[PDB]
């Protein structure tokens, strides 16, 4: 029952679900940005 | 705005404070003559209190005058006793050290002989003043930090004019007694032995010289920032910590992650100032006696930067282009 | 020709030094003693003279270096040397630096 | 000597590394000497913190206090600790500001917080209290600047909360410490002290901007009108500085 | 973590901008709006230094050298590896220094203390600002700023010093240097008095302000007091920073000849006989 | 997995500030690194491409 | 004060007046400024003491 | 998706001021970056284009 | 084994922050080390391969 | 019984198990990252 | 043996940070020493092998 | 023999910290001394043997 | 003789730490001084014998 921030297990579980929604969306945009740049001028 | 405690806005003057006393009987050698200056009282204490004149103080004052007079009499005689020319060239005249051809032997009076005699009285005068600081602390039953800090300054003072010339085997290595000439010596000393910038101890002494001004700006500002909590009464804040010591500590803890105590600040203050001439004395003592060229020492030890660009002005512009023609 | 034709064909003519004067300007004489009560290295400096370049540096730098072929170089050419007597001192550096403000 | 001990490690290089060892020892000595007060670290909840820092606590040093006030060893239990603080944590974790549970200036928290110093007056070399009113002080008088006695006192909101009846001086150092304020009946009841460092003295008035007119009635008082203890000193000075943030909501809220 | 007395001071408020969005502590450090910008500018500037060090070919801290562009580039932007990186790091450094000073304002506002420290730091910032932007602006090129190297920026000082043929003769340098040697003089003696009074010989009572007040009265005949030494002490160091800023801003924008030649006004005064 | 427990020890409004600076630090730093190179400096490549 | 500052203000104004006055009759700005600085310190100092 | 909860942890009025300053400074910075180049300096292009 | 007892000695919050700073400084340093080398500098190699 | 941080014996075990899971995932990414780089330009 | 009593002398939570910093500074320095030598610099060896 | 009494005079904590620091600095110095010499520098000898 | 009375004057703690620092610095100096000489430098001598 460790909680240094006071958030319960369900409270952080639902917050972390949103965090990955932002993280994956940010990564998804980064992938398309990286994919487009590689087609433009590849670095490999 | 809020009152920044920079100038006192009201001064109170009472009976002159003659000072504390104990079984050592300080009052015997005190002058018992006091004066109050309201001009200096705006920023500091206004009482020009009595001075304890002992035998270390008198000998230092008398011998210091002899060094001052011998230098001055020589400078006056250097310009042929022309007072208008002596005043005009006051910043340029000096008592030059002996010529290098004489080594450590006594040179003629006109060729640095009076320099050694004047230096002899200056050495006695400076050491006597240090003994006064040591004796006064012992007779005041306090620590000898004033004497110990002074000894650090004397260390560079002794190295510059007494220790290094002896190690170098020539009295010519001393510093001339002039306003501009000891600046010329300072520049010539750096040029003669390579580049004194690349002396690690000169760099180290600059670190503590910069740190001393940096700390004592920080300590002065912090105390004045907490002087609304009686922070200027540091001693009472050491024996009984008030909110002045807490906020001063927490200001620097929240700024840079660590702080000091009201007593521990002066240990930082004492040691940074004391290390300025201690490292400088070592750097000067190692100059000529060991190294004789510091930039080549830097190149040998691989900390002298290397540049790849060209050096001439023709590589960057033309003479006509600079002149705009 | 390696100096007056350094960059371009500048050259030197009679007008270069005189500039319309019977005696060229910026000529110098040996004001060696300058100081009255001193001798040696103390009698060539420590006074703002015409040749000292507004400094207390030696005023005999032009005489010793540009007329007497004295050694101008003062640095030690390696990291550490044995400072044997007769080597250039800070006084020689002071005189070299005096000539060199003139440059 | 111009010979290298090994490789390119000469006497100049040897002295440099000798100073590196000394400076490292000096830094350790200086930092530990700075830890005589405030440690152990503890956390927001008040329990001792898991982390205490790379430097260990120094050995106890003893101060022989004068005027028969006993000894003092700084590394140890701190008598200046304040209990029953009126604060609550805004977060369950660490590193977050505390929210005062009542009036921050009245409870003495934050900029208004004081420290539990000794409840005795500071004494000079002679032994009598260091800070005394000029009426009690003998031979003292104004030598320069504007005399604040009799001038009205203006608060931070422009209210006139009384006039300066007397000013307390440090006769040991011949320095002005406080100004007594004879609070008007409309604002206060008796006399309140304000430190010289938080009051700006003009030609016709003395202005303190940290404290509004309504906060003078709550300024901490002194037990006696002839001396002020270190505890009363700490409470009085902290109250005025607490007004720099707690006088009105505008000061506490961000300026932009 | 906290201190034994830190809890009662960690209160909400005192920010200049951002409110409670950033108003928290990370470890002992206080993080504000300007603590966020300090972190961004300091980290970006530090990384760009090591990025420039990587392409420079050496990571040796002594030999790292991010130099300003050539004087031909003027006040415009240069290629990032032809001196342009120095311009960005300067922008990051200025942003970090100003944020650091503004962060100190929030810290001392939350503690209800004076703003002397951020003001004193602003003088140090001004001394840096007059060295990196003000003087290059007056001289018309960003190449007049000092490079960002531990030993490379000493060569700039040495060359700029000898750019006026003897830099000791700078009148403002004399005033500024006199303040450094005296600020360390004041620091040594002031630190000694408090230590001497608080640490008497073993077996003897500690001393109060009177004993140190009468010590330099017995020593040098005058004592400026406990409060006065910090007041003159801040002024001595601030004047050291200010006059150092002056001596370099007049070297080249105001004075182009040798600094010894400046003293020619005193030598050839009409009162002096020929 | 159970990485959601990272919010049991790290408070959301103190880490999001931490990553906000860090993410923009990376975004600004990497772009400047590309601008330093002569191959990925899209600003000068437009000039080179247009001749 | 209200009188020492005024006397100090009078001295610095006289120092500026002596600075430009020497430039008009020849001299130089730096030579004139020193006498102006000297006049500010001497006349201002004398006034600050002679009249209070 | 469910990003509306970001205002449950960050103060809306504090964030808006912070992001308003960030957006302008970023906009001013990028504009100055364009002005530093030759290809994307619209002020210089107009002079070059007009004879 | 019993390596989990490191958290009875070390606070999880301070260690995680410690490695987060350390690991990124690792990543930044190593990436910069390769960028110093002429062989592993992928930015210059793109220019060479483009020809 | 001994804990300077206040964590219980079972609380630390739960925290460490997730930490190792994160450690292996971070290491697994690095191994693939190193493997791709080695095929790109081997350093052995 | 009986070396376990070192923890009766040293605080475990202060030694571990001390050795954690020491071990990495050890590891970095030996890596940097190897890189300085021309024989053991694997970055230049890779460049030489590729040729 | 009877040297155990040194711990009645020296604090075990202060000496052990000093001894640990002294031993590594002594060990580092001697390793650095050998590297300076051209006969005991094992890094340069490995290159010589390989060539 | 009866030199044991020196400890009635000198604190054993302060003398022992001073002696330990003095002994190593003295020992290090003599080792360094030998390394400076051309004769007793055992590192250079081993190279010569190779
Ligand atoms: C070299 C070839 C391309 C190039 C290749 C790439 C590639 C490849 C990528 C980028 C990516 C990015 N590039 Mg780029 N990029 C180039 C030139 C540019 C230029 C320009 C003027 O030339 C610009 C402006 C950018 C800008 C950007 C950003 C859009 C983005 C990185 C985001 C970041 O660092 O901050 C983000 C950090 C933040 C934390 C800032 C947050 C600030 C705001 C105000 C915070 C508000 C939060 C508040 C609480 C409100 C919350 C609301 C939420 C929406 C719910 N690039 C060149 C032309 N660029 C990278 C990316 O990730 O894109 C997604 C990417 O993958
Ligand atoms: C071209 C010039 C050379 C140069 C050549 C030197 C030389 C030469 C020296 C220094 C030294 C110093 N240099 Mg350097 N230095 C240069 C560039 C710099 C720069 C810079 C920004 O460029 C700086 C900041 C410094 C800074 C410093 C200080 C760190 C240091 C002096 C220590 C001290 O406090 O002295 C203060 C100490 C004293 C003044 C002497 C003690 C005085 C005695 C005790 C007092 C007696 C008083 C006397 C009796 C008169 C009393 C009269 C009263 C009215 C009664 N240097 C360049 C490289 N530098 C010194 C050093 O090396 O230290 C290791 C030194 O000798
Ligand atoms: C040939 C050399 C010439 C010479 C040429 C110069 C030149 C050229 C200069 C000086 C300047 C100075 N010289 Mg000089 N000078 C010489 C001889 C000397 C001697 C001596 C004993 O011989 C001395 C004492 C001095 C003394 C000084 C001071 C007047 C001044 C030093 C800089 C300054 O004040 O700080 C001011 C600088 C700052 C306050 C730095 C600001 C720091 C910032 C705000 C914070 C830094 C944070 C940073 C990121 C670190 C953080 C990292 C970690 C997290 C902590 N000079 C010789 C003759 N001198 C320098 C000057 O005045 O600069 C203004 C100057 O440019
Ligand atoms: C030379 C050939 C390849 C190369 C080969 C490699 C190899 C091989 C590796 C990398 C690695 C990495 N490379 Mg690389 N790399 C190259 C060029 C690049 C470039 C570029 C623009 O050119 C970039 C951006 C990167 C970037 C990166 C990162 C993806 C990664 C380093 C992570 C680290 O150091 O910090 C780590 C930072 C931290 C630990 C802190 C992160 C901070 C965040 C914001 C904290 C959030 C925590 C918060 C509580 C949320 C928690 C949520 C959890 C899910 C619960 N590389 C070249 C092209 N690179 C190294 C790596 O680590 O891979 C995993 C790796 O092994
Ligand atoms: C009154 C003038 C004196 C002074 C005062 C002063 N300095 C101060 C303060 C005060 C009152 C502070 O409160 C503040 C502080 O907190 O100090 C601990 C500070 C400070 N002055 C400092 C140092 C310092 N002071 C110096 C001098 C002085 N400062 C004067 C003597 C010097 C000199 C002479 O060079 C230095 C180096 C810092 C310890 C601190 C400022 C901390 C700071 O700015 O933090 C934010 C930035 C970073 C953590 C890193 C930023 C990195 C950059 C983005 C990139 C690099 C830029 C830089 C140009 C690098 C150049 C390197 C080469 C030159 C080697
Ligand atoms: C941003 C909104 C605030 C916010 O809430 O986001 C925070 C994240 O904080 C950040 O986004 C860091 C941005 C600070 C950098 C400012 C410099 C201006 C950008 C560069 C300009 C520089 C000036 C040069 C011309 C956490 O959440
Ligand atoms: C580089 C300078 C140099 C050049 C070239 C030069 N002179 Fe001279 N000249 C001198 C110097 C030095 C003096 C001595 C100073 C003096 O007498 O005033 C001098 C003096 C003289 C004098 C004597 C002045 C007197 O006081 O009576 C004459 C005549 C003379 N020059 C003629 C010439 C002529 C004609 C030329 C052109 C060919 C010439 N000089 C070019 C350097 C030179
Ligand atoms: C036109 C360039 C010129 C100027 C201006 C100049 N130098 Fe020189 N300098 C020289 C020449 C030529 C020499 C060579 C003399 C010799 O070695 O006989 C020299 C030699 C020196 C030496 C001797 C160094 C060594 O031991 O070889 C010093 C000292 C010196 N210069 C310092 C300075 C200083 C300080 C300045 C700044 C005022 C300066 N120089 C400016 C041309 C000049
Ligand atoms: C020097 O070297 C060179 C080669 C030059 C170099 O460049 C080296 C580069 C190097 C080393 C880069 C190393 C990169 C690393 C480490 C990558 C870190 C990046 C990471 C980890 C990505 C996080 C993404 C987080 C987001 C974007 C979350 C979105 C959050 C959203 C907004 C959700 C939150 C919203 C809510 C509503 C919460 C719910 C709230 C309640 C329920 C209340
Ligand atoms: C200079 O020399 C040159 C040659 C250049 C050089 O490069 C030298 C290089 C040198 C010396 C390498 C030095 C590197 C070393 C030593 C490697 C350390 C690296 C280590 C050790 C890897 C840790 C990984 C930890 C993670 C990444 C965990 C992930 C954490 C996750 C996220 C779990 C957290 C999740 C939770 C839910 C919270 C916990 C649970 C509860 C709260 C229940
Ligand atoms: C300069 O160049 C030249 C000249 C060439 C030069 O190099 C000169 C070299 C010179 C001069 C060398 C000077 C070296 C000297 C003098 C050697 C000192 C070195 C010594 C003496 C070695 C101590 C070793 C002690 C250990 C390793 C204990 C280990 C203890 C372990 C860890 C057990 C833990 C201990 C406990 C007690 C447990 C706790 C118990 C209870 C709590 C019950
Ligand atoms: C109006 O009154 C009259 C009277 C007319 C007058 O003119 C007043 C006097 C006037 C105006 C002279 C003004 C003096 C001036 C400007 C001098 C500035 C002085 C300066 C800058 C000092 C440089 C630093 C020198 C060092 C660093 C020394 C250190 C050397 C010490 C001393 C060590 C001892 C040396 C020895 C050799 C030992 C000898 C002993 C034996 C051999 C036993």
Author numbering:
A (entry chain e), J (entry chain f): 6 to 49
B (entry chain M): 2 to 326
C (entry chain C): 156 to 258
D (entry chain H): 1 to 256
E (entry chain L): 2 to 275
F (entry chain E), H (entry chain D), I (entry chain F), K (entry chain G), L (entry chain I): 2 to 52
G (entry chain O): 8 to 59
M (entry chain J): 2 to 51
Question: What do the authors say?
Answer:
By using cryogenic electron microscopy (cryo‐EM), we determined three structures of the DsRC‐LH1s purified in salt‐free, Mg2+‐containing, and EDTA‐2Na‐containing solutions with global resolutions of 2.7, 2.7, and 2.8 Å, respectively. The DsRC‐LH1 purified using Mg2+ solutions shows high homogeneity with a sharp peak after gel filtration using a Superose 6 Increase column. The vitrified DsRC‐LH1 sample was imaged, and, using the single‐particle analysis approach the structure of the DsRC‐LH1 was determined at a global resolution of 2.7 Å, as assessed by the gold standard Fourier shell correlation (FSC) at 0.143. The DsRC‐LH1 complex exhibits overall dimensions of ≈127 Å by 122 Å by 126 Å. In addition to the protein subunits, we identified 38 BChls a, two BPhes a, 35 spheroidenones, 14 lipids (12 phosphatidylglycerols and two di‐phosphatidylglycerol), three heme groups, two ubiquinone‐10 molecules, and one iron atom within the DsRC‐LH1. The purified DsRC‐LH1 complex showed high stability in Mg2+‐ or Ca2+‐containing solutions. In particular, the DsRC‐LH1 particles exhibited stable forms in Mg2+ and Ca2+ solutions, whereas most of the DsRC‐LH1 particles purified in salt‐free or EDTA‐2Na solutions were severely disrupted. When incubated at 50 °C, the DsRC‐LH1 samples in Mg2+ and Ca2+ solutions showed higher thermal stability and the relative intensity of LH1 Qy absorption at 867 nm decreased slightly within 90 min. However, in the DsRC‐LH1 the residues αn‐Asp49 and αn‐Ile51 are replaced by α‐Leu46 and α‐Ala47, resulting in the inability of Ca2+ to be stably bound at this position. This is consistent with the observation that the DsRC‐LH1 samples purified using Ca2+‐ or Mg2+‐containing solutions showed no significant changes in the absorption spectra compared to DsRC‐LH1 samples purified using salt‐free or EDTA‐2Na solutions. Since we found only two possible binding sites of bivalent ions in the DsRC‐LH1 complex, the stabilizing effects of bivalent ions on the complex may be mainly through non‐specific binding to the surface of the complex or the residues distributed in the gap between the reaction center and the LH1, which may also represent an adaptation to the marine environments where D. shibae has been found to exist.
